[PDB]
Amino acid sequence: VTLCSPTEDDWPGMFLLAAASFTDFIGPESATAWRTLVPTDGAVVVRDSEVVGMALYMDLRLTVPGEVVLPTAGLSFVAVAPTHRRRGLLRAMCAELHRRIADSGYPVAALHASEGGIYGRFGYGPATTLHELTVDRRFARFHADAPGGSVRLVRPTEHRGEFEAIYERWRQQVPGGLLRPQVLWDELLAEAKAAPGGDRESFALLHPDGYALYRVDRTDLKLARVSELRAVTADAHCALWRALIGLDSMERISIITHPQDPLPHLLTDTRLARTTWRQDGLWLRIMNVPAALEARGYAHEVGEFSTVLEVSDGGRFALKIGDGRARCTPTDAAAEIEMDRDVLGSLYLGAHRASTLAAANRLRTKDSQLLRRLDAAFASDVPVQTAFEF
Amino acid sequence: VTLCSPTEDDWPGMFLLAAASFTDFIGPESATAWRTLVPTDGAVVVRDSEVVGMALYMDLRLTVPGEVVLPTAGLSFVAVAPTHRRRGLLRAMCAELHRRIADSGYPVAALHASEGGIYGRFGYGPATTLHELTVDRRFARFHADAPGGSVRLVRPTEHRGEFEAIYERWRQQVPGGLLRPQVLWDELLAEAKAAPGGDRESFALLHPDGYALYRVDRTDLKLARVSELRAVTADAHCALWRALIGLDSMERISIITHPQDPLPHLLTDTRLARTTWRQDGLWLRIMNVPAALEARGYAHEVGEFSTVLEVSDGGRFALKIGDGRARCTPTDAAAEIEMDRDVLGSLYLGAHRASTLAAANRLRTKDSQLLRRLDAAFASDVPVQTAFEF
Amino acid sequence: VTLCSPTEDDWPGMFLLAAASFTDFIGPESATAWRTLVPTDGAVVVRDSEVVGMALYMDLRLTVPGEVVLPTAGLSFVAVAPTHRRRGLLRAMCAELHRRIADSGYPVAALHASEGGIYGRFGYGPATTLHELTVDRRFARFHADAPGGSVRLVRPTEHRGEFEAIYERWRQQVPGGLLRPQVLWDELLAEAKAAPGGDRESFALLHPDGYALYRVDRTDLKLARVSELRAVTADAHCALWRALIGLDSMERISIITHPQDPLPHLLTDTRLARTTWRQDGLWLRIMNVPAALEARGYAHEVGEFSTVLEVSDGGRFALKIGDGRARCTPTDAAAEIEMDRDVLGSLYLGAHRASTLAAANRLRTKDSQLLRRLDAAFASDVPVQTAFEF
Amino acid sequence: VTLCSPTEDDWPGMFLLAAASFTDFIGPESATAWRTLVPTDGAVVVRDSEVVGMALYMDLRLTVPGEVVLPTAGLSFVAVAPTHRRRGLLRAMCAELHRRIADSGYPVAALHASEGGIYGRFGYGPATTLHELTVDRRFARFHADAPGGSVRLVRPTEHRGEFEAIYERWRQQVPGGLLRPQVLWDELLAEAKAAPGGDRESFALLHPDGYALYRVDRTDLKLARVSELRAVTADAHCALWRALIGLDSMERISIITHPQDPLPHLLTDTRLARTTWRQDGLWLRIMNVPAALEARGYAHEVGEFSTVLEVSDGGRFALKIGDGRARCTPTDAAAEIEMDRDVLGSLYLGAHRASTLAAANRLRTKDSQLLRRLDAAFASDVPVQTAFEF
Predict the structure, then answer these.
(1) C-alpha pair distances (Å), B193 with each of A28, B126, B199, D15
(2) What is the radius of gyration, based on Cα positions, of chain C?
(3) What is the Cα–Cα distance from D342 to D168, expressed in whole angstroms?
(4) Do chains B and A touch (3 or more CB pairs under 8 A)?
(5) Where, by residue number, does acetyl-CoA bind (chains A, B, C, D)?
(6) Pairing relation of β-strands A43-47 and A51-64?
(7) Angle at CA A71, nearest 5°, toward A68 and A72?
(8) Hey, how many other C-beta atoms are within 10 angstroms of the C-beta on B297?
(9) Is the CB of C373 inside 8 Å of chain D's CB atoms?
(10) Is A119 annotated in the active site?
(11) Residue D89 assigned ligand-binding role
(12) What totals of helices (H) and strands (E) does chain C contain, helices first?
């Protein structure tokens, strides 16, 4: 087997492995748009001579706590032929891409994981939580305190400019936000069209400061699935949900959102917004510990403290956090905190508490006070959300 | 209809309404043990003359952030006859018990709610979250970092003393903890016996600093249900879970736990600990705002700040928080924060973020900085858990 | 009603009855390929004047024990209008086709039965067994003794020549094998293309001496269905299954195979290859008892014996079996074995033991020793498989 | 940990591990009857001091091809505490019991396996196949050839003598038969009584030469489950099935039987007897290869042949088979057949063909002719059945 950058001739072999590996890849036209986001030298293939393994990264922009945008290597299109399992092909491909990503100056990489037991060992930590709420909208009454009591029903394709502009405001403001380039809007609005023997037509609820894309389920005609709700204000979020609760021909509204979605609190019965599903969303690998820890904002409420952080096989650093900024500098002083690289990725966007990872011995410290300070500092003011799967 | 304290002769009528209202009440012997926790004047009945409505409170001890134990009025045994709906019987009974509870000097009341749309309007806020994890234990491997790699399989009835002592340590240390008196241990260990055409025998996994009571499901013989796992140390929690993952004849282990249960992080695949169910656990009504806000501990990391808190129809208070202590004193100065009483109950044990209740307009403030300070201060160092249903 | 050979003008009426009778017949283009296998005078229709009944046979080549290929009349396209039940239309059509098949010199006829209670009375015996194995491939580990530890993932349409050649070797070597002409390869590879609102794309695992065609289930995206696995060697069979167990995004692999499929024995846990479904496959009617009994090979291990076989209303024969060859000649000597014609079809490819049919009194003999000799002689060295449905 | 024979004081600890390990063990009274079949020194326990592991064997009598009865060590009551997995406790206990079983002069051991991946490595091969048939009895019509067209509906407890005598004839005549002592009849007839919140009453269909015990399913009141059908003659088997098809208030009859059950062939529609479940039944470990190979009968139809059989780490033997008898004697001549010990157990009662185990490379030989001779010789005239689980 040989690991090399793919040639134009290697692409048909990649498209075949893709079709066999992913239920979401239909054919070459499926790749056209995502491929525009792959840099020169962004891809590796393993040849046997047919393609038996592939992996690439895409140039992305990820928003992190403090509204800081990081160049981010989005790992994607990762597959090993069913003929070639247990030959370390994934280890080799990830090691080569991580080399190129680090040398190219990316502070972090990110992916969505098809299984939860794979990417931990390559330094990726689950960093956002997908939280499915299902509302029995037939009982839903808004609380007296709920805002409203502004939104228009529209065809997505006739308001592209306004979705683009609302999303752009949303992604810059929310940790987990990704820049969504032209070609990904082209794909999104092509999926909005009804599919013969497939998904139904998508409709949109448009507010000046928010939108919701939703579609009636292919088989359950009493279920509306919100694919996407981007709200820049609490008013937009409430207004949009009043409209979704107004889909009177539906029994149930489902959305994949985040754990801190305020929806339940908009209702007289919080229990109506039922959690039907939870899973890891975006995974992060911190490529450069100092660049990542320095780039992001920290809680202003915690007072200035100093410690020494060791990442297992990732360096040791004097970490000083105060006025919501971090300085992270080389040191050989005794470590006060130790953790594998994945644990740091899981901490980085505020989705997992340090004290929770400590109780499981994934983060190790002998100062329970330093543990409380870590928790408070790495917390995100704005709750972390998931932008889109790649 | 007449609302009065029940006579000894009124009890049979109460036992009948109970049997008809609750699927967990079998007959008079069902009440013997809970009744020892009801004070003189702890109960009201509505007569028509048969019992058509009843409610009572029990003398409980609830642990709150900072390991402070509060005398707590546990509302229980609440029923309105199906013949007497929409006549304000529940409003009248709750108003009378709240009078007696406030006059008796209880700073808080608590309940478990049969529906989520009832008790908000009587000032009760959902204050803990039940979080069901189901582990496909056939794939569960412990992470390298996981502690262990101490527990004994025992009959519960032969180790009462040691369960009592571990629970007693657990309940004093964890927000949501309740004192469990002799008679509730008598009931718990009577349920542990196998029931003809009912639940199977309960077994116990005993560690010096923790226990788990579990039982094979009545119908699904590949599912083990953990009724209760009390761990005083991270080592006890990990040791106990290694033992539960060792139930090799089971496919699945389910437990009702709390959102911050470290279990997922003990595994190479975090996704194996699936959230199968979420719901409100304990509800709190703050009877006395100053006594409750002063009694509990606050985060040391937030710096001293001062504000004015109004509870809708519950008073206005100068609130000063610093060194993890609150002073809460009468004032007529302009409110900076407003909220209904239920919202304060939901904040009180740290289960709901102020910024989440604000985004839904349940908590109102014009200083986003004061909002961040509220969040950080009301956070609990030790994650809030649910002791037992009543 | 009139039973006659169909005219070109009768075909549209046949295509209509077909569309109404079979869920697998879409329209005239559905018949083009199968029709090339129908000889002049191979078809009958019953007219009322519209077509109310039809039946035909196709010219096939069936492999039987000893690698002997028989000209075989494949009954197919059999339907009676829902308007014309219980008028003996099926009896009349089968009697006419059996006349023409016998006169044309076919030693056997064969069919696949839509119900199990129809064709027994026309002399057809179930002769192969379909055996669905479903593997929970997430637990499947190969035994130390298992071969391998050679196959390529390919698009079927780009390797037609190599599938044709492997199948051709397979069908000549295995009892139940059918010759698959060009036009049936045209159809097979046309089904391999993904269908809008239909089956997904088929992929292929290609070995020098074997192939597997498989497809992800239309609705269950964790199930891969093997449509066809043709292995000429034990190495090819094992190599192909290692590749199928390598479909890591699947939970389950299902195949319709034969009872003696060695797959279970390739695993450390034989129980993982679960039998999810069993049914009769190919049915045989012996048209000419002497020609059929003489054409096939018998077990070399049984010693030369002689008996007299009566087929109810099918003749009586002196049957001498030795050196794996049979002589079967007319006689009026006392019968030692009696059975209906269907029973002989069920014995013929080795799928059903004589002693099993005897215990049910379908085969009658007064010598338990002759019964043991029949069992051993009619056994097939190579286990009987099912080629393709028609 | 210490492995020793259990003391009378160790029994309560064993009863506790049992209740926690097996859903079929209710308490000490559950063991009384099985314990009478355990010889002095038949049991081992591992102490930590509480019981954390146990295993024992029972003195059984197993019928093998040629109606030969073997003293058989029935492994049973095998458990490792959930606290003590992956410490080789099962390996140690099986090694000690195998020592004592071999020294005591047992030619074979047997067990029923709770999982299919455990006992292969200790030399146990699956030796019988459980085959669940479910009959939609509303369509079942007996074939014209079917016998009958003698049985009485009785209470089991009033005809113990006649069940005992029929079973005793059955078990001596059928490979897989076990002697059923008094105390196991006491248990069987105690289970026949209806259980409060449990199984319904068992009824019996009694023929001079056969019986069926059946019970209506606890939840599905249209399903009758045959627990046991012992037929000494084909007439008894047919007569009994006519009676079961006469349970006109039922939709479905289910029985766990053997693959060669003639039932399907008693019907005009063979497809009505649907295979709903298949699994390994009895597992065999050959303790002494020569004693086991010599004790059993072989097919008279195969001619005298000689070979050299090696069992991996179990000796090499000159094996001569002719006139349905084997001589099996020590040799150092070149092996012609090799296999692990488990493979020999799987061959021993005729349930698995040598050529099937060869195709999976579990049995290795370079003479395809010797393979055909092995198949034919190890075949059982009387189809192997499963007596009762232990």
Answers:
(1) 63, 33, 8, 15
(2) 22
(3) 29
(4) yes
(5) 78-80, 86-91, 114-115
(6) antiparallel
(7) 110
(8) 17
(9) yes
(10) yes
(11) yes
(12) 10, 19
Are A346 and A127 spatial neighbours (Cβ–Cβ below 8 Å)? yes
Contact at CB, D234 and C270, closer than 8 angstroms: no
Residues near A18 by beta carbon (within 8 Å), at least 6 away in sequence:
A25, A30, A31, A54, A77, A79
- Say whether A268 and B353 touch across the interface (CB within 8 A): no
Residue ranges covered by each domain of chain B = 1-127+281-285, 128-280, 286-381
| Under 8 Å between Cβ of B236 and B208 | yes
Q: How far is CA A199 from CA A25, A167, C117, D234, in A?
A: 16, 23, 42, 58
Which residue numbers in chain C precede an interruption (C–N > 2.5 Å)?
48, 149
Write the burial class of residue B138 (CB in 10 Å: 0-12 exposed, 13-18 middle, 19+ buried). Answer: middle
The DSSP 8-state label assigned to residue D9 in this structure reads: G
Is some CB atom of chain D closer than 8 A to the CB atom of C366? no
Q: What number of CA atoms fall less than 13 Å from residue D177's CA on the CB side?
A: 24
Q: Is B203–D20 a contact, with Cβ atoms under 8 angstroms apart?
A: yes
A30 alpha-carbon distance from chain centroid: 21
Any idea what the Cα angle at residue D99 is, between residues D97 and D104, rounded to 5°? Answer: 95
At C305, which amino acid appears? F
How far is Cα A159 from Cα A153, in angstroms, rounded to an integer?
Answer: 11
Neighbouring subunits of D (3+ Cβ pairs under 8 A): B, C
Identify all chain A residues contacting B302, using CB atoms and an 8 Å cutoff: 301
Resolution to 1 decimal place, in Å: 2.4
Distance in Å, alpha carbon of C380 to nearest chain D alpha carbon? 10
Which residues between 142 and 171 in chain C have a beta carbon less than 8 angstroms from any beta carbon of chain D? Answer: 143, 145-147
Supply angle C-alpha C228, C233, C235, rounded to 5: 100
Burial (CB count within 10 angstroms: exposed 0-12, middle 13-18, buried 19+), residue D256: buried
CA–CA min distance C189, chain D (Å): 30
D69 is in an annotated binding site: no
Distance CA A63, CA A177 (A): 5
Chain A, window 185-244: residues with a beta carbon less than 8 angstroms from a chain B beta carbon:
234, 237-238
> Does the beta carbon of A26 lie under 8 angstroms from any beta carbon of chain C?
yes
Give me the catalytic one of C77, C119, C163, C167. C119
- Asked if A341 contacts A286 with a C-beta cutoff of 8 angstroms, the reply is yes
Residue of A nearest to B232 (CA): A359
Q: What is the edge-to-edge ordering of all strands in the sheet holding B51-64?
A: B2-4, B43-47, B51-64, B68-80, B108-112, B282-286, B125-126
Query: Residue B115, Cβ neighbours under 10 Å: how many?
Result: 9
Contacts of C155 in chain A (CB under 8 A): 16
Question: What is the SS3 assignment for B28?
Answer: helix
Instruction: Name every chain A residue with its beta carbon within 8 A of the beta carbon of C153.
Output: 16-17, 20, 50, 81-83
Contact predicate C153/A17, CB 8 Å: yes
For the sheet with C223-231, list strands across it. C152-154, C203-207, C210-216, C223-231, C252-257, C129-136, C273-280
Q: Which residues of D touch B153 (CB under 8 A)?
A: 16-17, 20, 50, 81-83
Assess whether B124 carries a catalytic annotation: no
- The CATH architecture of the domain made up of D1-127+281-285 is 3-Layer(aba) Sandwich (3.40)
Whether B86 has a binding-site annotation, put simply, is yes
User: Which residue reads 């869920």 in tokens?
Assistant: C23
- The closest CB to that of D82, out of B194, B196, B246, belongs to B246
CATH fit for domain B286-381, picks 3.90.1300.10, 3.30.1050.10, 3.40.50.1000, 3.40.390.10: 3.30.1050.10
DSSP, residue by residue, C168-188: HHHHHHSTT-B---HHHHHHH
* Fold held by A128-280: Aminopeptidase (3.40.630)
Ligand-binding annotation for D218, yes or no, is no
CB atoms within 10 A of CB B174: 21
